Write a protein that binds this DNA or RNA. Structure first.
Length: 87
DNA sequence: CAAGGCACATGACAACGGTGTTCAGTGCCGCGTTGCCCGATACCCCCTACCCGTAGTTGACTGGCATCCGGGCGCCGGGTCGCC
């Protein structure tokens, strides 16, 4: 029962291709640099800090895009490795 | 014939005889309470074969696993659907 609901929760999400995934990774590194700059104790402009924060949030969104995409692969591997004592 | 003079013994007189006593001291030779001298054993030390925790492994490899019955009865009780 619950696994059916989790597979439903996976539902339909956009699968990832080479161009989409590499663009997402580019946004990820952009956001990582943005939060790096934010974490620096040096004073930064307020609007600049908000720009860095929003790109970091967009990178987080990209992260969840990758994870929600590859839930299907990880459950495939789980099927490969299940039935040996753990749930 | 009576009174006065000499022998032997005699009332006491201490001091020896000999033995068993008073202190008292110190041992004599049987029973006890603690000194040896060791010997062992508990407590520190160093490192090392192994136990246990963590870090990676670049073709790709994108939804499981189901259940499946001959009770059977019987009721309660409520939920959902039907009626209108």
């Amino acid at each position: 029962d619950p696994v059916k609901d989790y597979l439903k929760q996976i539902g339909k999400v956009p699968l990832l291709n080479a161009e989409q995934e590499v663009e997402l990774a580019k946004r990820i590194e952009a956001g990582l640099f943005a939060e790096d700059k934010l974490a620096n104790s040096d004073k930064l402009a307020p609007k600049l800090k908000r720009e860095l924060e929003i790109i970091a949030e967009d990178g987080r969104r990209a992260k969840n895009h990758l994870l929600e995409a590859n839930l299907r692969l990880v459950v495939s591997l789980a099927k490969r490795y299940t039935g040996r004592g753990m749930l």
